[PDB]
């Protein structure tokens, strides 16, 4: 067995919640833990001193370090889902410049991203917008998985992670769960449950995966950061999160509250001259109102977003710091009770979807 | 009774009245005809000082020290913070606060207060600016109270060595009003002079009239800052009229809306039609978009990472405007400003017939004939 990178500090006796630490080489790295991408707050004037006083200490990068100016860790993709067909080879598009035939092999991206030096790296995958070509494309997954692990020649500096495939289909990821857990790889990611419209299903993946996955391995689940998926899925047993939803919500006028999110281009906001969040330690509940975030978005609403997004991304940062914290105290229980009655109200309120997944591990609001 | 002055002539135009200078600011000279981006638009945007300070900006526009905030090693210009920031008597401006939500005061004295503090080589009076739907004669008791206001700013004002106050004229498109505020604030020693109130106009023919009115009158051996003005015409024909200074928020503007400035005036890459086009934005534009996107990559980025696209047509649409004036000010110092502007007016319309009315005859006031 090779080095383990997750160190496991506090676990929920309830439920599958889980408290640890990532020993990463630009620094230790508290789970669980939400990643921003890094390069959609940059694009909006947020530098590396904000997100490192934010206690930021890991971010999504499209060496690189430098490139940033961070002195912490980063986690960067393959680049697939971004840039078309698809063959055994790898993924094949045409360049952004020359505009000639271009491809991307399984083990271009492992160089790729060795040459950016990040501190995460992922698989490349091959991913489909039905009939069975789904399951062609989970099995090429695999066998990417082992170019990628061959071609990768510094685990000491880099790792690598696995990215479960299947999508909705609980016989396909069942049979990529068995397949890749057979590879020694510090880590796995958990793919394809991004923006799905069944929350029930979303959830029952979720569950289904976390239940095959290493104890003493991460578990990194992709596009996800909504508040309350956020904390039903640390309860099923996830450690990593990434999504642009604190970037989104912002782009939309919308500051991220316990019970929601302050549609801020509302009238009723004009006159408001308290914070977003009285509570809240960020800087742009220090020096900003609603009153006058609500104005900004009117005429200034370029300078509107930067406010709004370092007070969402900050959000985040604290919401699973608090959940992290009642790990530890042994209270992630009571933790979930409030959090739900807060964010909607009363238990008869809450969506099904998460008292049902709550329940599966024993957290009860009733 | 004058004061050591801060602009160089360089060279001069023979037929029409296009200056080529160099201003002796603080934080280093600055080669004029300039055009100043807004500062804090394009660090909203992930423009970072080197990104800028590559692109030649030796001077852009503050908010409102100022200059660590930014990290900025070069100029600055702030303005006095009315136009932001109700009702309006002679102690100052009164307004609701942002923060308190209490009523609050900007005076002269307190504006000047605030960008000595800030530490920009520039600073603007503050003055009283009334809509242009205002009409009678409270229209002309405004222009009577700027001029109190700056003499107000002067005496607030204890380090003429360290920041330079510039006065703004005032009258809008009145010829009768704006002939008194010119006659009244240049009696006032300050080291430049702004031209305030011809932003945004409808009236392109008294536009042009109002801009040649003001440096008729406005001191040769000083700067004239025009207030507002990006559009590349624009700034073409004001050039040929006798200004030296220009800021807008037009290059971040037009980013917005999908559009990169081109000599034959704009790219408009949200249209399909640049979806396969795989050559940058400008073949023969040195800066770094023009270096690694392509038009249809832009145009795939403004359909789905709106965000990043927006980046990148900054850098390019600020880097044209720095150009264009570059270009602007070399044609003059090589004796061949009328030249210069006969071959842009061709790139950028086509021909004299299609030219806009209005600067056909605004340069034809000052020998450009096309
Ligand atoms: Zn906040
Ligand atoms: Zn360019």
Redesign the pocket.
Known sequence: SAPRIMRLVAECSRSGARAGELRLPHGTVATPVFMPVGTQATMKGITTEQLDSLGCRICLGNGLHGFMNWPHNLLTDSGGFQMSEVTEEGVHFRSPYDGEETLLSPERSVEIQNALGSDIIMQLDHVVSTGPLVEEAMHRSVRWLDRCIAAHKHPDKQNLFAIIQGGLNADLRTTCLKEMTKRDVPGFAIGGLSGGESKAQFWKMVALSTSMLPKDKPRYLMGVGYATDLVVCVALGCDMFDCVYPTRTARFGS?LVPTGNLQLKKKQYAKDFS???PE???P??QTHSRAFLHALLHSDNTTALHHLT??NI??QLQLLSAVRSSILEQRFPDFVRNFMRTMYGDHSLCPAWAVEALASVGIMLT
């Open positions: 500051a914070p977003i969040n809240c330690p960020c742009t509940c370092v007070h900050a959000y």
